[PDB]
Design a protein around this nucleic acid. Structure first.
Ligand SMILES: NC[C@@H]1O[C@H](O[C@H]2[C@@H](O)[C@H](O[C@@H]3[C@@H](O)[C@H](N)C[C@H](N)[C@H]3O[C@H]3O[C@H](CO)[C@@H](O)[C@H](O)[C@H]3N)O[C@@H]2CO)[C@H](N)[C@@H](O)[C@@H]1O
Ligand SMILES: [Mg+2]
Ligand SMILES: [Mg+2]
Ligand SMILES: [Mg+2]
Ligand SMILES: [Mg+2]
Ligand SMILES: [Mg+2]
Ligand SMILES: [Mg+2]
Ligand SMILES: [Mg+2]
Ligand SMILES: [Mg+2]
Ligand SMILES: [Mg+2]
Ligand SMILES: [Mg+2]
Ligand SMILES: [Mg+2]
Ligand SMILES: [Mg+2]
Ligand SMILES: [Mg+2]
Ligand SMILES: [Mg+2]
Ligand SMILES: [Mg+2]
Ligand SMILES: [Mg+2]
Ligand SMILES: [Mg+2]
Ligand SMILES: [Mg+2]
Ligand SMILES: [Mg+2]
Ligand SMILES: [Mg+2]
Ligand SMILES: [Mg+2]
Ligand SMILES: [Mg+2]
Ligand SMILES: [Mg+2]
Ligand SMILES: [Mg+2]
Ligand SMILES: [Mg+2]
Ligand SMILES: [Mg+2]
Ligand SMILES: [Mg+2]
Ligand SMILES: [Mg+2]
Ligand SMILES: [Mg+2]
Ligand SMILES: [Mg+2]
Ligand SMILES: [Mg+2]
Ligand SMILES: [Mg+2]
Ligand SMILES: [Mg+2]
Ligand SMILES: [Mg+2]
Ligand SMILES: [Mg+2]
Ligand SMILES: [Mg+2]
Ligand SMILES: [Mg+2]
Ligand SMILES: [Mg+2]
Ligand SMILES: [Mg+2]
Ligand SMILES: [Mg+2]
Ligand SMILES: [Mg+2]
Ligand SMILES: [Mg+2]
Ligand SMILES: [Mg+2]
Ligand SMILES: [Mg+2]
Ligand SMILES: [Mg+2]
Ligand SMILES: [Mg+2]
Ligand SMILES: [Mg+2]
Ligand SMILES: [Mg+2]
Ligand SMILES: [Mg+2]
Ligand SMILES: [Mg+2]
Ligand SMILES: [Mg+2]
Ligand SMILES: [Mg+2]
Ligand SMILES: [Mg+2]
Ligand SMILES: [Mg+2]
Ligand SMILES: [Mg+2]
Ligand SMILES: [Mg+2]
Ligand SMILES: [Mg+2]
Ligand SMILES: [Mg+2]
Ligand SMILES: [Mg+2]
Ligand SMILES: [Mg+2]
Ligand SMILES: [Mg+2]
Ligand SMILES: [Mg+2]
Ligand SMILES: [Mg+2]
Ligand SMILES: [Mg+2]
Ligand SMILES: [Mg+2]
Ligand SMILES: [Mg+2]
Ligand SMILES: [Mg+2]
Ligand SMILES: [Mg+2]
Ligand SMILES: [Mg+2]
Ligand SMILES: [Mg+2]
Ligand SMILES: [Mg+2]
Ligand SMILES: [Mg+2]
Ligand SMILES: [Mg+2]
Ligand SMILES: [Mg+2]
Ligand SMILES: [Mg+2]
Ligand SMILES: [Mg+2]
Ligand SMILES: [Mg+2]
Ligand SMILES: [Mg+2]
Ligand SMILES: [Mg+2]
Ligand SMILES: [Mg+2]
Ligand SMILES: [Mg+2]
Ligand SMILES: [Mg+2]
Ligand SMILES: [Mg+2]
Ligand SMILES: [Mg+2]
Ligand SMILES: [Mg+2]
Ligand SMILES: [Mg+2]
Ligand SMILES: [Mg+2]
Ligand SMILES: [Mg+2]
Ligand SMILES: [Mg+2]
Ligand SMILES: [Mg+2]
Ligand SMILES: [Mg+2]
Ligand SMILES: [Mg+2]
Ligand SMILES: [Mg+2]
Ligand SMILES: [Mg+2]
Ligand SMILES: [Mg+2]
Ligand SMILES: [Mg+2]
Ligand SMILES: [Mg+2]
Ligand SMILES: [Mg+2]
Ligand SMILES: [Mg+2]
Ligand SMILES: [Mg+2]
Ligand SMILES: [Mg+2]
Ligand SMILES: [Mg+2]
Ligand SMILES: [Mg+2]
Ligand SMILES: [Mg+2]
Ligand SMILES: [Mg+2]
Ligand SMILES: [Mg+2]
Ligand SMILES: [Mg+2]
Ligand SMILES: [Mg+2]
Ligand SMILES: [Mg+2]
Ligand SMILES: [Mg+2]
Ligand SMILES: [Mg+2]
Ligand SMILES: [Mg+2]
Ligand SMILES: [Mg+2]
Ligand SMILES: [Mg+2]
Ligand SMILES: [Mg+2]
Ligand SMILES: [Mg+2]
Ligand SMILES: [Mg+2]
Ligand SMILES: [Mg+2]
Ligand SMILES: [Mg+2]
Ligand SMILES: [Mg+2]
Ligand SMILES: [Mg+2]
Ligand SMILES: [Mg+2]
Ligand SMILES: [Mg+2]
Ligand SMILES: [Mg+2]
Ligand SMILES: [Mg+2]
Ligand SMILES: [Mg+2]
Ligand SMILES: [Mg+2]
Ligand SMILES: [Mg+2]
Ligand SMILES: [Mg+2]
Ligand SMILES: [Mg+2]
Ligand SMILES: [Mg+2]
Ligand SMILES: [Mg+2]
Ligand SMILES: [Mg+2]
Ligand SMILES: [Mg+2]
Ligand SMILES: [Mg+2]
Ligand SMILES: [Mg+2]
Ligand SMILES: [Mg+2]
Ligand SMILES: [Mg+2]
Ligand SMILES: [Mg+2]
Ligand SMILES: [Mg+2]
Ligand SMILES: [Mg+2]
Ligand SMILES: [Mg+2]
Ligand SMILES: [Mg+2]
Ligand SMILES: [Mg+2]
Ligand SMILES: [Mg+2]
Ligand SMILES: [Mg+2]
Ligand SMILES: [Mg+2]
Ligand SMILES: [Mg+2]
Ligand SMILES: [Mg+2]
Ligand SMILES: [Mg+2]
Ligand SMILES: [Mg+2]
Ligand SMILES: [Mg+2]
Ligand SMILES: [Mg+2]
Ligand SMILES: [Mg+2]
Ligand SMILES: [Mg+2]
Ligand SMILES: [Mg+2]
Ligand SMILES: [Mg+2]
Ligand SMILES: [Mg+2]
Ligand SMILES: [Mg+2]
Ligand SMILES: [Mg+2]
Ligand SMILES: [Mg+2]
Ligand SMILES: [Mg+2]
Ligand SMILES: [Mg+2]
Ligand SMILES: [Mg+2]
Ligand SMILES: [Mg+2]
Ligand SMILES: [Mg+2]
Ligand SMILES: [Mg+2]
Ligand SMILES: [Mg+2]
Ligand SMILES: [Mg+2]
Ligand SMILES: [Mg+2]
Ligand SMILES: [Mg+2]
Ligand SMILES: [Mg+2]
Ligand SMILES: [Mg+2]
Ligand SMILES: [Mg+2]
Ligand SMILES: [Mg+2]
Ligand SMILES: [Mg+2]
Ligand SMILES: [Mg+2]
Ligand SMILES: [Mg+2]
Ligand SMILES: [Mg+2]
Ligand SMILES: [Mg+2]
Ligand SMILES: [Mg+2]
Ligand SMILES: [Mg+2]
Lengths: 271, 48
RNA sequence: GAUGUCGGCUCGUCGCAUCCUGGGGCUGAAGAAGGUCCCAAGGGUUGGGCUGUUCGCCCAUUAAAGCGGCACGCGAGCUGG
RNA sequence: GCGAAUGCCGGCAUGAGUAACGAUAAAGAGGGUGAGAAUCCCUCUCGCCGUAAGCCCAAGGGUUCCUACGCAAUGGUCGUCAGCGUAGGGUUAGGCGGGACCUAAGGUGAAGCCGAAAGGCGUAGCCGAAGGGCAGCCGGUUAAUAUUCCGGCCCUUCCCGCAGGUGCGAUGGGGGGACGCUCUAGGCUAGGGGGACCGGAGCCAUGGACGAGCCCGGCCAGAAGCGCAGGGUGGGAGGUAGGCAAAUCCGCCUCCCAACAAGCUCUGCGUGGUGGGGAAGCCCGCAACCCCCCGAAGCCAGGGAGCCAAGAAAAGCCUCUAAGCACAACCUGCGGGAACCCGUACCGCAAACCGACACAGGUGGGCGGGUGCAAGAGCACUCAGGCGCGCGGGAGAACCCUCGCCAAGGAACUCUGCAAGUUGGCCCCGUAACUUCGGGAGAAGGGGUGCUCCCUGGGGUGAUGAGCCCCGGGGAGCCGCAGUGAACAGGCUCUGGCGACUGUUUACCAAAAACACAGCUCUCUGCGAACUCGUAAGAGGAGGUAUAGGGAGCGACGCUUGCCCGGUGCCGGAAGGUCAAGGGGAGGGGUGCAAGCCCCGAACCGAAGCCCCGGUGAACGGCGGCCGUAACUAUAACGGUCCUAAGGUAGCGAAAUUCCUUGUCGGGUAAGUUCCGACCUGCACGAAAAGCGUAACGACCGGAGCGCUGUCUCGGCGAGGGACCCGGUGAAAUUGAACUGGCCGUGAAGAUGCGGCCUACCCGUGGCAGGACGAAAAGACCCCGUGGAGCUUUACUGCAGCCUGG
RNA sequence: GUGAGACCCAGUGGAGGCCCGAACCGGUGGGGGAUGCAAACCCCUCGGAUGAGCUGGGGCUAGGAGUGAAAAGCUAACCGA
RNA sequence: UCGUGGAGCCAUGGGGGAAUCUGGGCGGACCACCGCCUAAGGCUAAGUACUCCGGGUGACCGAUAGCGCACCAGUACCGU
RNA sequence: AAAAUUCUUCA
RNA sequence: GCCCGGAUAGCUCAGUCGGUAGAGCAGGGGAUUGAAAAUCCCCGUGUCCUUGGUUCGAUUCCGAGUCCGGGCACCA
RNA sequence: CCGAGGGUAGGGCCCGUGACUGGGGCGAAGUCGUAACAAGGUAGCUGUACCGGAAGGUGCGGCUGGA
RNA sequence: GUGGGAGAGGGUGGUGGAAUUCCCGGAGUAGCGGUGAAAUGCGCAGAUACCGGGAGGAACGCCGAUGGCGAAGGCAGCCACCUGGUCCACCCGUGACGCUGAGGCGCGAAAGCGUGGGGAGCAAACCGGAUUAGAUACCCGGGUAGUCCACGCCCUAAACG
């Protein structure tokens, strides 16, 4: 729902946090599965290549399953729904009848105790992953694969989800979270339902820090630097860019389409 | 106040060490030159 | 191969084309006041409001609140608005 | 062949016996020593520090440590002294810290990938430490070392043997190791305060005291056992699609038993056989070691609760099985043996480290006693302990520095209350507009504070009752000028501008109104993402996936954000126009006696780009002018007309913007180029280079008031550190050479140096700064040079990159 | 309190880029210093001080390159290369 | 020597792609003669260059010269 | 389902 | 103070090449109305600012000037 | 002790006045249009919303006191 | 109370077909549109007109009325669940328990506001084209908020019989 605070301090008036009842249950990550020293670092081999990243609360990583086809047919009981710091969603831990456990970006609705599974036979109900071709046109599904056997890669951010628009050949049409209509293979898996924790889009960082705890360093405007630093830069006291909106690298930044034209990945898109 | 020289044995060697000179083709050419000239010390001498 | 630049402060000193105070001729000078011109700096020539201001404009007085020169006197004396 | 080059190397001058001698914590005397002592040693007075100016440890420094000789130099003076010279000594570890252990970022790097070479990436592995893991505590000794040597008590590994246990057995599997912030409970310990009690040499002074007097000290370590605190922890028995099935171990199902437990374990603290230490005191040598109380930030520890930002790894260590092996082998006991390498002096907030210096600067971790002030690591004094800052002695000018006080006035000072003053703690009353209901608030403005005597209420600890502490409540009364009696310790208010806010910045002239900021919008990006770095491989993005990532502007919040796509940019346009290779060769040329061999080459087919068409403003941007008109005049709701892509809407407005200007009214003032409120002919506001506001916030900028003041009228006195004199040591920039006066002139136009005249015995000391166009910097402005660099763009020309045909 | 609520009182509770205030990190105004104690220091005063905090050790990024809460600041006492 | 030039020759990143002596390259576009030469595999002393090193000479220096060092110098010292 | 504005004052 | 731009019918503004000068609005006269507007027919208008000069001829091309407009005045 | 009152500080209600500013009322014959009364020449009115010289226009819904 | 009845009373979930718009596909060619007449505008880059498939949003034709239900506002496709009011029949039970109702509390068309979503049609403002003396209007071509859903506000009306 999102917690609100009385203004017993500015910023704390505008501040809001996520309701943690969905997760209220198992805060400590499963010592196996999640355990994975996660390496922080805002640059590659030397230089920074994504400005303004850095700092930000120590974060332990949690490995999730983005290809539930591992255990086809093997059902599992959702042991618990915990908080994952490395993502917008909430993951859910689930023990399989097999014994093996693992996390799954918890879908909106899924509840602890519910049984769930993955496969063709699999029943169409929130939490079960199936190959697209076997999923009722129109249903909402998330964590959609994009190419058979290559893992989930679509609609995984809290509250996101794509809708099955129709079949057509070995492919099926999908209106993705952005709204684009892409044809995706039939063998491509996906777990039924929406991502959940849709409230996310409503939390208000509130202060300047918080934005720091998230690991995002202060971002500085082009026109605030100088001729050398940026192209908007310079100008004897405050000025209107100088035309036309560009980036520190010098490419137009208002409307100039960037995706590669000759990309063979077209032919499967429409939006 | 803090002055440019803040002594540290490890740094000094890890940085201008002999082994250090040897790894870089550039440092190799440093020792090359030093020996050439006649320097009594090729590497900034230090001891532990 | 540098003569520090406006204003203020401190310290002055000089010119006279005199703002006072001294003399004196006219007066359309009754007296008192004045106006004007001549002789004369010896000594005087206020405290505030506003502005960085010099300058002025006001306030309250005054015998008068003179004009001007000394690298628009004076930063190896001060201040830097 | 030198006289000049702010020439170069060296030497020596001037300033100059001048400035200065490095914290204003402070000295005095008497003994020694010695050729010679303010300065070295000893004693006695005195002052300074005491979250230290004292102890301990890292880093760094490397003999500075200790002893004996020493004083040329070094030491800002002196020097018998020394961190100095010469010489000799000195650093002892299975347990402390590193290594024959572990992993982190990162490094390196088999494989593997890449790159003209050099090289770049890079899996396992390896390297990598204040992190993990690992066995020593209390004393005693040396001139100098000690958890190292010695004493006492207590341990750890390996190796061998013995005895009893058991499926023993990995580099493999699993568990564990293992983790955040804030707040916390209970016991303890460190530490500290009391004692009428215990042990002591002694002490009655100067009017009093033989006193429950005064003064000193009343602990430390310690196996097993035993206590008191905890911390960890269900056992069962079956199944078993997982732990890249090797497992009786994990993990999942299922079911007898068992639960805010007990037991089992593992630490902490007492206690403990016994060992050790043990003052003030005189000739330098007498021993208790008990009882209360306050009590941690440390310990039990992996305790608890709450929170969102969601909090290393690996080994040791358990456990499971594989090969193998079961004569092994591990396990537990018990004895015997074995136990290497490196460091260990000393300095360590400083004279031994980093600052050329014995430099007022900088330097990480731990302990940091007592009393009083609400508390505290703050403040004053003071323990332990350590210092009096390596030039002194006088004098008592000006002038400067730091500092105290002041009549009357009280901001008149001045750009400005700059500065300094006032105010200042705690307790209680009592507190406005406005407001986002939090705040404003410590608003303002007040009263209280000492000591003594009585009465009185809770609490902890005991034991409910004494003490010992811990919070109060009500009376009487005493003395001062004054009761946080010293020290530490906001001046308050009203009203504007800017920015919401805490925050960041020009290390070394700018801390702001600038940057950032949550938040708003635009745009890109469907994942081998876009974007960035790289020739590449690869990496970041991100072990993310449109509620996500990149770029851009605005910048909390409230009310809002208008018109114009003509030009420009971007977006969309399968048509057209133009269009490069290349395709195609109508037709023509060179040659050959020829077949030929060689060249040119028109139609047409030929991309992207451009042209063209249409969209687009929280995309670059733009957002008018002149005449006329109302029944007093004025003014002009109304009319006309030129021009445009379209003519500035709301709001605001002589403003961080207004030139004319001190606009013009009004407020404030005795008086107001500033300020506040208005007006609007806005030179030249205006809506996300956002417009207008706004509670709160600000070492931000403006205007006023009250309070208090040496800011001032207007200065005076006083203190200390210098200045001055004497003794010691002794620089500097500058300097053509000097025997260096005024005025009126003259002179390259501002003369000590020419002319004329006027002054003026020779030489210093303390002062003042008018001149020597004083010093300092080959002017930073200016211009010049076909000098240079940084930056811009619809300058030129290229290149990366991106698009594109073949 | 109501039908149930919301909401309202006390008490407990201990949040926060909250407040005073050291240590600590800074560097506001004024004074001194200016051949200094010092190639940025000292004095009085002042900002923050549970956070976008400060700090030790071990690492990585660099010359048209890095880094930058943005000053063309810093990159070993002078950085438009 | 060759800066697109009438630009051959010798190399060669890309595309196409032969023949074995009636073969094949060259003689400055290109043809025709005439003549030279044998590609797509390799080796090869000497004459030549240099002076760390040893010697000999000097209308070379003679301690501010001559090497940066005549001397315990790539030292002291400065700098991470 | 309609092209189309107006009528000084006092009586 | 310098460099720019105009001016033409009553008004707002077109145009020229050296021969010609215009439009809209206004206005004058009829028409519709009961009467005004509107609307409908008819109509007239120019020293092309003054000014000298050129030319065969100037609103137009030069030279001077008046007016009304806009734009610069920087380094200090 | 209390105490008239005076002093200092902070609040509350109230009346007057103020550059300037907003509408309002009233005043024979000024200006611009003509919204309403006859489908008032787009039926009228109406709540709210935005826009315009001005009546007023348009949106959405409602009424008939319109057909 | 017992037993029966009618209803667009209300809330939630699901669902149907027609139509408009857009998208793809086919087929087709010189206009379509719109009006009082026109023009703007869409169209040879292939529109209008016709067919097939798909998307999505809003509203439910006929039934349907001068009808029904609700306290009022208001409420209409179908289905299911949850739920209020109401009428008749039987005279069974209670035994005046009633009426009204300042204040309070709740509901309350449309428009408007907030947070997010949704967006086909329509459509203030706005932009064009006409009409006009002018035309910030009536007409035409576009067009944003809004209209839509959820949650929270607003609380007015010719909320009228
Ligand atoms: N009537 C007064 C109120 O204001 C308006 O009315 C005011 C004006 O509109 C009106 O003006 C009229 C004008 O419309 C009409 N065409 C011409 C007339 N001469 C004017 O009249 C007005 O001015 C004149 C002087 O000039 C006075 O003598 C006369 O009393 C006065 N009413 O005069 C009124 C002033 O009183 C409203 N229309 C009216 O409904 C309202 O009630
Ligand atoms: Mg920014
Ligand atoms: Mg800037
Ligand atoms: Mg640009
Ligand atoms: Mg640029
Ligand atoms: Mg710019
Ligand atoms: Mg500007
Ligand atoms: Mg140095
Ligand atoms: Mg080290
Ligand atoms: Mg070394
Ligand atoms: Mg000179
Ligand atoms: Mg005089
Ligand atoms: Mg004078
Ligand atoms: Mg002067
Ligand atoms: Mg000066
Ligand atoms: Mg002078
Ligand atoms: Mg001076
Ligand atoms: Mg100044
Ligand atoms: Mg010479
Ligand atoms: Mg000298
Ligand atoms: Mg002298
Ligand atoms: Mg002297
Ligand atoms: Mg002296
Ligand atoms: Mg000294
Ligand atoms: Mg003797
Ligand atoms: Mg050391
Ligand atoms: Mg030595
Ligand atoms: Mg001796
Ligand atoms: Mg000496
Ligand atoms: Mg001696
Ligand atoms: Mg010594
Ligand atoms: Mg010695
Ligand atoms: Mg050891
Ligand atoms: Mg060994
Ligand atoms: Mg590497
Ligand atoms: Mg490598
Ligand atoms: Mg190692
Ligand atoms: Mg270690
Ligand atoms: Mg640890
Ligand atoms: Mg360790
Ligand atoms: Mg560990
Ligand atoms: Mg150890
Ligand atoms: Mg021990
Ligand atoms: Mg010692
Ligand atoms: Mg076993
Ligand atoms: Mg393990
Ligand atoms: Mg642990
Ligand atoms: Mg406790
Ligand atoms: Mg104890
Ligand atoms: Mg005691
Ligand atoms: Mg006595
Ligand atoms: Mg003890
Ligand atoms: Mg099992
Ligand atoms: Mg196996
Ligand atoms: Mg004990
Ligand atoms: Mg206790
Ligand atoms: Mg086996
Ligand atoms: Mg032995
Ligand atoms: Mg030691
Ligand atoms: Mg310390
Ligand atoms: Mg040093
Ligand atoms: Mg000293
Ligand atoms: Mg020092
Ligand atoms: Mg420190
Ligand atoms: Mg206190
Ligand atoms: Mg102290
Ligand atoms: Mg006085
Ligand atoms: Mg007095
Ligand atoms: Mg004054
Ligand atoms: Mg004055
Ligand atoms: Mg002033
Ligand atoms: Mg000022
Ligand atoms: Mg002050
Ligand atoms: Mg109020
Ligand atoms: Mg007393
Ligand atoms: Mg006090
Ligand atoms: Mg203080
Ligand atoms: Mg105030
Ligand atoms: Mg600010
Ligand atoms: Mg703060
Ligand atoms: Mg700083
Ligand atoms: Mg600075
Ligand atoms: Mg500041
Ligand atoms: Mg500063
Ligand atoms: Mg990743
Ligand atoms: Mg974005
Ligand atoms: Mg962003
Ligand atoms: Mg901004
Ligand atoms: Mg702004
Ligand atoms: Mg705009
Ligand atoms: Mg435009
Ligand atoms: Mg366009
Ligand atoms: Mg295109
Ligand atoms: Mg061609
Ligand atoms: Mg083309
Ligand atoms: Mg106009
Ligand atoms: Mg008139
Ligand atoms: Mg008239
Ligand atoms: Mg304007
Ligand atoms: Mg407008
Ligand atoms: Mg104005
Ligand atoms: Mg003014
Ligand atoms: Mg302006
Ligand atoms: Mg002005
Ligand atoms: Mg002015
Ligand atoms: Mg006045
Ligand atoms: Mg002012
Ligand atoms: Mg003033
Ligand atoms: Mg004003
Ligand atoms: Mg502006
Ligand atoms: Mg803008
Ligand atoms: Mg404003
Ligand atoms: Mg500030
Ligand atoms: Mg004074
Ligand atoms: Mg004195
Ligand atoms: Mg002397
Ligand atoms: Mg002269
Ligand atoms: Mg002479
Ligand atoms: Mg002479
Ligand atoms: Mg003298
Ligand atoms: Mg002088
Ligand atoms: Mg002097
Ligand atoms: Mg000079
Ligand atoms: Mg020069
Ligand atoms: Mg030139
Ligand atoms: Mg350069
Ligand atoms: Mg060009
Ligand atoms: Mg009720
Ligand atoms: Mg509470
Ligand atoms: Mg704070
Ligand atoms: Mg100063
Ligand atoms: Mg000075
Ligand atoms: Mg402070
Ligand atoms: Mg604070
Ligand atoms: Mg570090
Ligand atoms: Mg380091
Ligand atoms: Mg560079
Ligand atoms: Mg920074
Ligand atoms: Mg740079
Ligand atoms: Mg050429
Ligand atoms: Mg050939
Ligand atoms: Mg050839
Ligand atoms: Mg040849
Ligand atoms: Mg040949
Ligand atoms: Mg060869
Ligand atoms: Mg050879
Ligand atoms: Mg030599
Ligand atoms: Mg000689
Ligand atoms: Mg060195
Ligand atoms: Mg009329
Ligand atoms: Mg009439
Ligand atoms: Mg009439
Ligand atoms: Mg005319
Ligand atoms: Mg009025
Ligand atoms: Mg009126
Ligand atoms: Mg009407
Ligand atoms: Mg009408
Ligand atoms: Mg109509
Ligand atoms: Mg009508
Ligand atoms: Mg009404
Ligand atoms: Mg209007
Ligand atoms: Mg209006
Ligand atoms: Mg108008
Ligand atoms: Mg309208
Ligand atoms: Mg209607
Ligand atoms: Mg109704
Ligand atoms: Mg109606
Ligand atoms: Mg009706
Ligand atoms: Mg449409
Ligand atoms: Mg079609
Ligand atoms: Mg077709
Ligand atoms: Mg309903
Ligand atoms: Mg019912
Ligand atoms: Mg009865
Ligand atoms: Mg309503
Ligand atoms: Mg509505
Ligand atoms: Mg609105
Ligand atoms: Mg609103
Ligand atoms: Mg429409
Ligand atoms: Mg009409
Ligand atoms: Mg709805
Ligand atoms: Mg209401
Ligand atoms: Mg009705």
């Amino acid at each position: 729902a999102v917690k609100k605070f009385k203004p017993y301090t500015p910023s704390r008036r505008f501040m809001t946090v996520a309701d943690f009842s969905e997760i209220t249950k198992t805060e400590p990550e499963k010592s196996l599965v999640k355990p994975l020293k996660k390496t922080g670092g805002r640059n590659n081999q030397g230089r920074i290549t994504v400005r303004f990243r850095g700092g930000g609360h120590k974060r332990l990583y949690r490995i999730i399953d983005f290809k539930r086809w591992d255990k086809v047919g093997i059902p599992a009981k959702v042991a618990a729904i915990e908080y994952d710091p490395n993502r917008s969603a909430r993951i859910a831990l689930l023990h399989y009848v097999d014994g093996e456990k693992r996390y799954i970006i918890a879908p909106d609705g899924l509840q602890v105790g519910q049984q769930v599974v993955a496969g063709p036979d699999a029943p169409i109900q929130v939490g079960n992953a199936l190959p697209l071709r076997f999923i009722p046109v129109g249903t909402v599904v998330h964590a959609v694969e994009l190419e058979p056997k290559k893992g989930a890669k679509l609609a995984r951010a809290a509250g996101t989800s794509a809708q099955i628009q129709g079949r057509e050949g070995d492919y099926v049409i999908l209106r993705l979270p952005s709204g684009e209509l892409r044809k995706v293979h039939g063998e491509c898996y996906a777990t039924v339902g929406a991502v959940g924790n849709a409230d996310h889009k409503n939390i208000v960082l509130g202060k300047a820090g918080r934005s720091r705890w998230l690991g995002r360093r202060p971002h500085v405007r082009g026109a605030a630097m100088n001729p050398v630093d940026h192209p908007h830069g310079g100008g004897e006291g405050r000025a209107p860019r100088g035309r036309p909106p560009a980036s520190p690298w010098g490419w137009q930044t208002k409307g100039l389409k960037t995706r590669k034209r000759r990309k063979p990945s077209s032919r499967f898109i429409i939006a | 106040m803090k002055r440019t020289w803040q002594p540290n044995r490890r740094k000094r060697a890890k940085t201008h060490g002999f082994r250090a000179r040897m790894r870089t083709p550039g440092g190799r050419k440093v020792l090359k030159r030093r020996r050439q000239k006649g320097r009594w010390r090729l590497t900034p001498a230090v001891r532990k």
